[PDB]
Input
Amino acid sequence: MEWLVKKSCCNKQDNRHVLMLCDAGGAIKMIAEVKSDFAVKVGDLLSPLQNALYCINREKLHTVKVLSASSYSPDEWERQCKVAG
Amino acid sequence: MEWLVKKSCCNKQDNRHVLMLCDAGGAIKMIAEVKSDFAVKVGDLLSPLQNALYCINREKLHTVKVLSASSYSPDEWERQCKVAG
Output
């Protein structure tokens, strides 16, 4: 699955973001803690390469590692935008 | 196969390098035209992720795209360190 980044949330010193993502279909919305050397900004597409390795906007060279995920809740996003900063 | 970068060769404006690589065993030495956002320096290891997608020193987030390859000849390296700069 490809995921559209619906919301982003940053780190003050880390390479991490916390992302709200939803599938094409948007049946499924997830919160994900990711790590990348490149910026992923809302309206970006993440496409699977390998196990938890994704690329940004189909650029294979711009990879991101999913460090963890959960499905979305309004509260869990704020729970998770805490551990983030 | 993993490849050890034996020699590197740069681009003045591109994201490209030309690399001499050899397999562990060093039976096989190749010249390769690659593209990366990260630096690959001699004594680096490139490990396969996917088709022509490699990572540097087993860092999945530091990917490189092989744009083309040939086996090594002394002359072909200089032939190729021309197209490079």
